[PDB]
Design an enzyme around this catalytic site. Structure first.
Site, PDB file in Angstrom:
ATOM      1  N   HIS A  61       0.803  -1.175   0.010  1.00 34.67           N
ATOM      2  CA  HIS A  61       0.054   0.028   0.254  1.00 34.67           C
ATOM      3  C   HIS A  61       0.757   1.305   0.144  1.00 34.67           C
ATOM      4  CE1 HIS A  61       0.629   0.054   4.433  1.00 34.67           C
ATOM      5  NE2 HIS A  61       0.268  -1.418   4.338  1.00 34.67           N
ATOM      6  N   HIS A  91       6.596   6.873   5.625  1.00 34.69           N
ATOM      7  CA  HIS A  91       5.994   6.428   4.408  1.00 34.69           C
ATOM      8  C   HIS A  91       5.361   7.457   3.674  1.00 34.69           C
ATOM      9  CE1 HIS A  91       2.595   6.044   7.212  1.00 34.69           C
ATOM     10  NE2 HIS A  91       1.950   6.585   6.248  1.00 34.69           N
ATOM     11  N   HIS A  93       2.024   8.964   0.819  1.00 34.18           N
ATOM     12  CA  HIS A  93       0.815   8.819   0.075  1.00 34.18           C
ATOM     13  C   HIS A  93       0.731   9.842  -1.160  1.00 34.18           C
ATOM     14  CE1 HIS A  93      -0.934   6.785   3.266  1.00 34.18           C
ATOM     15  NE2 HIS A  93      -0.402   7.557   4.303  1.00 34.18           N
ATOM     16  N   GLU A 103      -3.554  13.188   1.868  1.00 36.04           N
ATOM     17  CA  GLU A 103      -4.490  12.825   2.664  1.00 36.04           C
ATOM     18  C   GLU A 103      -5.199  13.950   3.450  1.00 36.04           C
ATOM     19  OE1 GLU A 103      -3.186   9.410   5.041  1.00 36.04           O
ATOM     20  OE2 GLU A 103      -4.089   8.264   3.381  1.00 36.04           O
ATOM     21  N   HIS A 116       4.190  10.935   6.088  1.00 35.28           N
ATOM     22  CA  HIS A 116       4.230  10.368   7.393  1.00 35.28           C
ATOM     23  C   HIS A 116       5.315  10.070   8.253  1.00 35.28           C
ATOM     24  CE1 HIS A 116      -0.632  10.222   6.125  1.00 35.28           C
ATOM     25  NE2 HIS A 116      -0.115  11.579   6.300  1.00 35.28           N
ATOM     26  N   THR A 195      -4.655   6.301   9.041  1.00 38.00           N
ATOM     27  CA  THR A 195      -5.372   6.370   7.664  1.00 38.00           C
ATOM     28  C   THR A 195      -5.466   5.160   6.803  1.00 38.00           C
ATOM     29  OG1 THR A 195      -3.516   7.318   6.486  1.00 38.00           O
ATOM     30  CG2 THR A 195      -4.811   8.708   7.817  1.00 38.00           C
ATOM     31  N   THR A 196      -4.865   4.208   7.556  1.00 36.08           N
ATOM     32  CA  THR A 196      -4.962   2.958   6.823  1.00 36.08           C
ATOM     33  C   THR A 196      -5.548   1.810   8.028  1.00 36.08           C
ATOM     34  OG1 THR A 196      -2.750   2.391   7.251  1.00 36.08           O
ATOM     35  CG2 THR A 196      -3.605   3.042   5.102  1.00 36.08           C
TER      36      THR A 196
HETATM   37  N1  LIG Z   1      -0.967   6.447   7.369  1.00 42.22           N
HETATM   38  S1  LIG Z   1      -0.903   6.836   8.975  1.00 42.22           S
HETATM   39  O1  LIG Z   1      -1.932   7.437   9.632  1.00 42.22           O
HETATM   40  O2  LIG Z   1       0.477   7.421   9.288  1.00 42.22           O
HETATM   41  C1  LIG Z   1      -0.533   5.232   9.667  1.00 42.22           C
HETATM   42  C2  LIG Z   1       0.442   4.925  10.745  1.00 42.22           C
HETATM   43  C3  LIG Z   1       0.899   3.737  11.088  1.00 42.22           C
HETATM   44  C4  LIG Z   1      -0.154   2.459  10.820  1.00 42.22           C
HETATM   45  C5  LIG Z   1      -0.288   1.118  11.364  1.00 42.22           C
HETATM   46  C6  LIG Z   1      -0.573   0.098  10.817  1.00 42.22           C
HETATM   47  C7  LIG Z   1      -0.427  -1.447  11.505  1.00 42.22           C
HETATM   48  C8  LIG Z   1       0.044  -1.354  12.658  1.00 42.22           C
HETATM   49  C9  LIG Z   1       0.444   0.109  13.331  1.00 42.22           C
HETATM   50  C10 LIG Z   1       0.404   1.017  12.966  1.00 42.22           C
HETATM   51  C11 LIG Z   1      -1.305   2.647  10.042  1.00 42.22           C
HETATM   52  C12 LIG Z   1      -1.769   4.130   9.454  1.00 42.22           C
HETATM   53 ZN   LIG Z   2       0.083   7.564   6.287  1.00 43.89          ZN
END
Ligand SMILES: NS(=O)(=O)c1ccc(-c2ccccc2)cc1
Ligand SMILES: [Zn+2]
Length: 257
Positions: A61, A91, A93, A103, A116, A195-196
């Site tokens: 993703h 990471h 988006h 986002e 992020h 956000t995921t």
């Molecule tokens: N896009 S985000 O809001 O910065 C995000 C960061 C960590 C996670 C995540 C996923 C699985 C386990 C721990 C953190 C999900 C989304």
């Molecule tokens: Zn993110």
């Protein structure tokens, strides 16, 4: 599983993760005339001088750069936060074209991408525990616009052909995330969520007002990555962003007047 297409995208996520329709979901639109200046907000403290990057990974993703979080090496503090949060990963988006990809939005404006930097609160001991707490994580969000190249991003761009497809990873040691920051640390902050999936409502969001500029060649290399694994029909990793969610009973606060 979940993804970003017609049949598994953000409109579908609530079926497996019903908190998708919760009271503090992210991202949101930042209405800059409605966000109130808070003079009690402290400056952010970004202490990344000892950051120890480990790996870069295509997780199907996004792509992620992971850091050693077994010590207080790279920590986020101050701002709206109480306590110390350790940097685990960053990471991005991004979009299929420059007019979408972020986002969060600012007065409904969409940036080409959004960075992020994901931190977790050390009082909970590990990130798995932290995600179960309303103050467990702090994510520092940085917008990307297309213009001049960002020199501190090029080491990331340089290696993306080696992790084209889901599941591929590479050594990515000695990367300094300070090269990704804008000049100003002025920020907006609200309580929100991942956000995921699992979309957990565990995040203090800190969104910087100043975007960084990246070149069209740099973002082009993002758009060449793939959602699929190797050997599957190629589906370009683009438009891996969740749209803005209802603000509901929340106020966005600004650290700057
Ligand atoms: N896009 S985000 O809001 O910065 C995000 C960061 C960590 C996670 C995540 C996923 C699985 C386990 C721990 C953190 C999900 C989304
Ligand atoms: Zn993110």
């Amino acid at each position: 599983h979940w993804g970003y297409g017609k049949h598994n995208g953000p409109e579908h996520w609530h079926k497996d993760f019903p908190i998708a329709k919760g009271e503090r979901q992210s991202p949101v639109d930042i209405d800059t005339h409605t966000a109130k200046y808070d003079p009690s907000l402290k400056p952010l403290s970004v202490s990344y001088d000892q950051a120890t990057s480990l790996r870069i990974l295509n997780n199907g993703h996004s792509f992620q750069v992971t850091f050693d979080d077994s010590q207080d090496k790279a920590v986020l503090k101050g701002g709206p936060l109480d306590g110390t949060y350790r940097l685990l990963q960053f990471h991005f988006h991004w979009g299929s074209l420059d007019g979408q990809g972020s986002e969060h939005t600012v007065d409904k404006k969409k940036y080409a991408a959004e960075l992020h930097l994901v931190h977790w609160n050390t009082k909970y001991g590990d990130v798995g525990k932290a995600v179960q707490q309303p103050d467990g994580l702090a994510v520092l969000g940085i917008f990307l616009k297309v213009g001049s190249a960002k020199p501190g991003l090029q080491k990331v761009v340089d290696v993306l052909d080696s992790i084209k497809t889901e599941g591929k990873s590479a050594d990515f040691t000695n990367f300094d995330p300070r090269g990704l920051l804008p000049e100003s640390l002025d920020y907006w902050t609200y309580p929100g969520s991942l956000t995921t999936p699992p979309l957990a409502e565990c995040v203090t969001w800190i969104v910087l007002k100043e975007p960084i500029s990246v070149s069209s060649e740099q973002v082009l290399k993002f758009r060449k990555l793939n959602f699929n694994g190797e050997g599957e029909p190629e589906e370009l990793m683009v438009d891996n962003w969740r749209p803005a969610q209802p603000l509901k009973n929340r106020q966005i606060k600004a650290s700057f007047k």
